[PDB]
Ligand binder design. Structure first.
Ligand SMILES: Nc1nc2c(ncn2[C@@H]2O[C@H](COP(=O)(O)OP(=O)(O)O)[C@@H](O)[C@H]2O)c(=O)[nH]1
Ligand SMILES: Nc1nc2c(ncn2[C@@H]2O[C@H](COP(=O)(O)OP(=O)(O)O)[C@@H](O)[C@H]2O)c(=O)[nH]1
Ligand SMILES: C[N+](C)(C)C
Ligand SMILES: [Cl-]
Ligand SMILES: [Cl-]
Ligand SMILES: [Cl-]
Ligand SMILES: [Cl-]
Lengths: 175, 178
């Protein structure tokens, strides 16, 4: 049977930590990252994941911290290893700028549900990585100009990244 | 900023097979791209069906997986790391195009996404040192697992696929079909 272990974050309610089972053999492995039946149920108000994205990045890249008012995400690493970070970026939240970090790889296949209004980021600790995330929203995709950005090393968040000198976009330097 | 786009083409000989090519934003860090939106891709399925299931297959060099299909499951397949030869086969015994096939080479620079109809066989070969194969499934009701599926031999002479190897790495299921 295709299985998910579904846990909720202790501190950051709305953050789900989902672990799939896998079939492993002489060929490699097969696994399920998502079913609507298991995972859309976790979203509020009948929302559904409706968008799939891939990010292929080199060693020591950070992408983040990115979010917007409406977009839920479901994120994992399907090749290599990342440090996956979620941040509560709701300024009026009692848990504003609290965060959680996960080291995601083939041996620790955590899939993180990131609420709307949370910031999302990852660091490539492998030589290369392929990051997978689904997006749930109504209406039009929120592109970069319509998103907020927090600095990867914002002192108020205090993420313990394995780098002091990541490779960054101009967006992620300007934050 | 860059706009998310798809180029959507239908196969000439195998109607129902779509070849979808995304754009990508490529920079100093690597690339970001969209494999699927419901708005662009679910409308290609018949009768209100929707993709509701996402799967990953991480395979070693020289593996073949296939040829597998079932009577209800539509698939949307690509390779998100490395390189595969992706093959679709019309496996409907009463189809005018029964055992006709199409082969696509999928890699980072040729990011084809193949919509495979229900009743079609699916297969891929890993030409890179390793590959991650991504596919979505659209069906109603319970997932169609191995016992629910049909199986055609990778080297079925009636299909005549041109594979790079005579020595693919196979499961017992895929060997049994020979
Ligand atoms: N946990 C898990 N197991 C799977 C999955 N897909 C297949 N399996 C198991 O792994 C074996 C290999 O599957 P396969 O023969 O390729 O059938 P198919 O994957 O349904 O086409 C099957 O016997 C399944 O029980 C999956 O997504 N998750
Ligand atoms: N073609 C395509 N371009 C994208 C996609 N996502 C983002 N972009 C573009 O790539 C640029 C960088 O993406 P951004 O939103 O900063 O996310 P990041 O790349 O993870 O930092 C933006 O200016 C977008 O216009 C996508 O899915 N497809
Ligand atoms: C292409 N379609 C009309 C079957 C949806
Ligand atoms: Cl993001
Ligand atoms: Cl931390
Ligand atoms: Cl398949
Ligand atoms: Cl061929």
């Amino acid at each position: 049977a295709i299985e998910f272990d579904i846990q909720e974050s202790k501190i950051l309610k709305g953050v789900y930590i989902i672990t799939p089972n896998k079939f492993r053999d002489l060929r490699g492995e097969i696994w399920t990252a998502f079913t609507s039946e298991a995972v859309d149920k976790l979203l509020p108000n009948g929302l559904k994941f409706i968008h799939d994205k891939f990010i292929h990045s080199k060693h020591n890249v950070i992408r983040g911290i990115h979010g917007d008012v409406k977009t839920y995400k479901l994120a994992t690493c399907v090749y290599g290893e990342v440090h996956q970070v979620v941040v509560d970026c709701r300024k009026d939240s009692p848990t504003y700028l609290k965060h959680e970090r996960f080291i995601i790889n083939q041996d620790n296949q955590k899939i993180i549900l990131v609420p709307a209004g949370f910031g999302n980021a990852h660091y490539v600790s492998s030589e290369t990585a392929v990051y997978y995330y689904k997006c749930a929203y109504l209406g039009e995709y929120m592109d970069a100009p319509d998103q907020f950005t927090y600095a990867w090393n914002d002192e108020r968040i205090g993420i313990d990244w394995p780098t002091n000198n990541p490779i960054l976009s101009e967006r992620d330097i300007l934050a």
